[PDB]
Amino acid sequence: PRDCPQECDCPPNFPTAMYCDNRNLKYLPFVPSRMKYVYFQNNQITSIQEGVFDNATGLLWIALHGNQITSDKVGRKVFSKLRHLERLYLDHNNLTRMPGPLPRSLRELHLDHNQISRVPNNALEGLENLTALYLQHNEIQEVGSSMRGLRSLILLDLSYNHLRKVPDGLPSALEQLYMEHNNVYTVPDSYFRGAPKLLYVRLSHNSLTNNGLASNTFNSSSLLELDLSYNQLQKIPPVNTNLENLYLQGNRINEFSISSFCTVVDVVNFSKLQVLRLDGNEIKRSAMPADAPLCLRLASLIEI
Ligand SMILES: *[C@@H]1O[C@H](CO[C@@H]2O[C@@H](C)[C@@H](O)[C@@H](O)[C@@H]2O)[C@@H](O[C@@H]2O[C@H](CO)[C@@H](O[C@@H]3O[C@H](CO)[C@@H](O)[C@H](O)[C@@H]3O)[C@H](O)[C@H]2NC(C)=O)[C@H](O)[C@H]1NC(C)=O
Ligand SMILES: *[C@@H]1O[C@H](CO[C@@H]2O[C@@H](C)[C@@H](O)[C@@H](O)[C@@H]2O)[C@@H](O[C@@H]2O[C@H](CO)[C@@H](O[C@@H]3O[C@H](CO)[C@@H](O)[C@H](O)[C@@H]3O)[C@H](O)[C@H]2NC(C)=O)[C@H](O)[C@H]1NC(C)=O
Ligand SMILES: *[C@@H]1O[C@H](CO[C@@H]2O[C@@H](C)[C@@H](O)[C@@H](O)[C@@H]2O)[C@@H](O[C@@H]2O[C@H](CO)[C@@H](O[C@@H]3O[C@H](CO)[C@@H](O)[C@H](O)[C@@H]3O)[C@H](O)[C@H]2NC(C)=O)[C@H](O)[C@H]1NC(C)=O
Ligand SMILES: *[C@@H]1O[C@H](CO[C@@H]2O[C@@H](C)[C@@H](O)[C@@H](O)[C@@H]2O)[C@@H](O[C@@H]2O[C@H](CO)[C@@H](O[C@@H]3O[C@H](CO)[C@@H](O)[C@H](O)[C@@H]3O)[C@H](O)[C@H]2NC(C)=O)[C@H](O)[C@H]1NC(C)=O
Ligand SMILES: [Cl-]
Ligand code: NI
């Protein structure tokens, strides 16, 4: 049992892999039953025909990035019988909608550099082993509640999109969240309290104003780095003493309030901030009081 499409290469030393990448292919051949790894990247494929993977029920990897696939030419239920699929690469195509339904066994999903306009609420239903989701460089306007059920998700990249609203609910294991270069103008009260293990957040180049925030929005005990540069902030939003890096350059901040870092300062209460950028705002260095180091006791680099 070693049949192989003529346009592809199947190594004898590794009979469960099939290489069809970078060959000017125009369509997908039907995959042999034994295959676990298939590589179709960097061709001129335009469609994923119905039933293409139905013989290979043991597929783990599918690489389809770097083609010209459109959403109307993704076959019906084409991924449905692949109940062990772990990794799927669909970045750099011509997709306008989320493909699906997707197998509940997925661990990584790449969908960046397409033209996806929206993530419906049920688009990622049941993917409880998904650890990384790449969606940057699309035209997404909203994702709704699609992220709530992803119990294993560590990384979510939504940067360089058209987001008007932050995701309505975050999963509990999330550590990295990137949403820079979007159109966010509001963030709700206690938004990050639902993500106990969140470490890195980027929200630069959006349309944030203090009136669109709550007092405690960015006060979270888990955060290490927070990037909010080039918004339209007039005041330093309050933060937790655990925060280590804060970027606020290119805003409209017109006062230095020490109470944004520490509500009370004593021998054991103080900010652990190491890096702080406040340059490109409406304050001079003299706006920072002489006794500021009592609060910012660890600040090694402060730019104003
Ligand atoms: C996709 O899969 C089909 C069917 O797979 C068959 O059913 C599965 C449940 C497994 O048990 C497979 O092992 C099994 O093959 C493949 O078609 C099948 O091809 C084989 C040839 O290797 C056919 O067997 C032969 O059939 C002739 C005619 O009856 C006999 O004279 C021979 O003695 C021998 O038995 C088998 O009949 C055929 N099955 C069907 C339903 O047509 C198909 O090749 C495969 N495609 C790829 C690309 O892998
Ligand atoms: C899949 O998408 C590619 C790329 O689409 C490009 O990026 C998008 C974000 C939009 O901005 C699109 O407007 C943009 O094209 C498509 O490739 C594109 O094909 C068209 C023709 O089909 C190309 O236009 C030509 O451009 C040359 C100059 O190089 C002119 O001389 C021609 O007269 C003609 O106008 C376009 O340049 C090309 N873009 C890229 C980046 O290669 C692709 O067609 C599409 N595939 C499907 C199946 O929809
Ligand atoms: C979500 O993922 C879990 C667990 O995945 C596991 O953990 C990873 C870190 C890796 O180590 C993976 O290799 C590993 O599978 C899935 O649960 C697992 O399901 C498989 C069935 O496909 C179970 O296989 C069994 O394993 C036992 C040995 O304990 C054998 O005796 C059996 O014959 C059978 O092969 C596996 O045990 C099970 N693991 C756990 C920890 O539950 C889960 O299926 C997956 N979710 C979805 C929807 O696919
Ligand atoms: C950032 O957030 C911390 C902690 O926030 C606490 O936990 C959240 C989940 C919410 O439930 C908050 O409501 C809650 O306060 C803030 O630290 C907290 O500051 C308050 C002062 O407003 C402390 O409360 C006071 O404590 C004294 C002495 O115990 C009492 O006498 C007072 O009556 C009053 O209750 C609170 O103890 C303190 N918590 C911790 C864990 O340190 C922090 O102020 C905030 N930062 C900014 C800039 O707003
Ligand atoms: Cl980039
Ligand atoms: Ni880019």
Numbering used by the authors: 73 to 376
Lines from the paper:
The small leucine-rich proteoglycans (SLRPs) constitute a family of secreted proteins with important roles in extracellular matrix assembly and cell signalling. The SLRPs belong to the large superfamily of leucine-rich repeat (LRR) proteins, which includes not only secreted proteins but also a large number of cell surface receptors, such as the Toll-like receptors involved in innate immunity, the platelet von Willebrand factor receptor, glycoprotein Ib, and proteins involved in neural development. Here, we report the crystal structure of fibromodulin and a different crystal form of chondroadherin, which reveal that these SLRPs do not self-associate in the same manner as decorin or biglycan. The results demonstrate that, unlike decorin, neither fibromodulin nor chondroadherin forms a stable dimer in solution.
Fibromodulin, a class II SLRP, is associated with dense collagen matrix in tendons and ligaments, as well as in fibrotic tissues, tumors and atherosclerotic plaques. We obtained crystals of a natively glycosylated human fibromodulin construct in which ten N-terminal tyrosines were mutated to serine to abolish sulphation (N-terminally truncated fibromodulin was not well expressed). The fibromodulin crystal structure at 2.21 Å resolution is complete except for the disordered N-terminal region. The asymmetric unit of the crystals contains two structurally very similar copies of fibromodulin (r.m.s. deviation of 0.2 Å for 306 Cα atoms). We observed electron density for the innermost four sugar moieties at all four sites, namely the two N-acetyl-glucosamines of the chitobiose core, the branching mannose, and a fucose α1,6-linked to the first N-acetylglucosamine. Fibromodulin adopts the curved solenoid structure characteristic of all LRR proteins. The N-terminal cap (LRRNT, 79-106) contains two conserved disulphide bonds (Cys76-Cys82, Cys80-Cys92) and seals the hydrophobic core of the LRR region. The LRRNT of fibromodulin is followed by eleven LRRs (II-XII) that contain the consensus sequence LxxLxLxxNxL. LRR XI contains a protruding loop that is characteristic of SLRP classes I, II or III and has been termed the “ear”. The ear spans from the first conserved C-terminal cysteine (Cys334, disulphide bonded to Cys367) to the β-strand of LRR XII.
